[PDB]
Amino acid sequence: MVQQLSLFGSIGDDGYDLLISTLTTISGNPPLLYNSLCTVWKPNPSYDVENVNSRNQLVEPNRIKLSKEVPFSYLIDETMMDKPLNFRILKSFTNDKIPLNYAMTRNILWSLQISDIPAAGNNRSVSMQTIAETIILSSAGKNSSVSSLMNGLGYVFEFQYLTIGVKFFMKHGLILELQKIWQIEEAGNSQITSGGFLLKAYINVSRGTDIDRINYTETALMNLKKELQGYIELSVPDRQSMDSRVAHGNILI
């Protein structure tokens, strides 16, 4: 469980290369390639959860995220082994098509994660969100599989998507991510972040009670934002967009 303090933004791919150089001028570090695959699961509507205390609202149903890393050998087509595995490959990832299709992901079926809507009030300068996390290491039995496990808990699959981007590690534990997101269905693959990169700068705090640390984290994030003034505008997203409860449906992408 962490308090994640975050700021968001977006950029057009035209400046992409330039942006990268500037980051290396500041951090002093080179970018590192990465990828991931997230699957979202929701409580089964076939089961009537009368246990939701309607007269008191002790709790509301929520959605579970399962993440995993996928090797690049599934994301590189027959035209791309010649180039080395570095960040420049992202320049060729502008098409809505991608080597990883629905059948391979179905064949695949980790990190389990749950979150809450950010803190209310208009006196917050950065998006503060609470995250509860655990890890699944292995399994066994006659039906050892992620799908069977989540159906045993009482959850069913809803959708999935694939993230590819680069990471920058700066001082004080600040992490800056440049991402491209591909939604995947049997109908096909569609790039929601079409013609651009999604930028997200964030820090993690282990204990929410410590307030000196939280103040330091906010100071670092606002200093970073004030450093990038004039190039990219980093902003607090909409509090109602980062809500992932089942009752109301929307997805920040």
Binding site: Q3, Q57, V59, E60, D116, A119, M128, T130, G208, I211
Partner: peptide
């Protein structure tokens, strides 16, 4: 605190 589910959510400040 009864209706606001945030018994486990509200973070307190000074």
């Amino acid at each position: 605190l009864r209706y606001s589910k945030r018994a486990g959510d509200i973070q307190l400040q000074y």
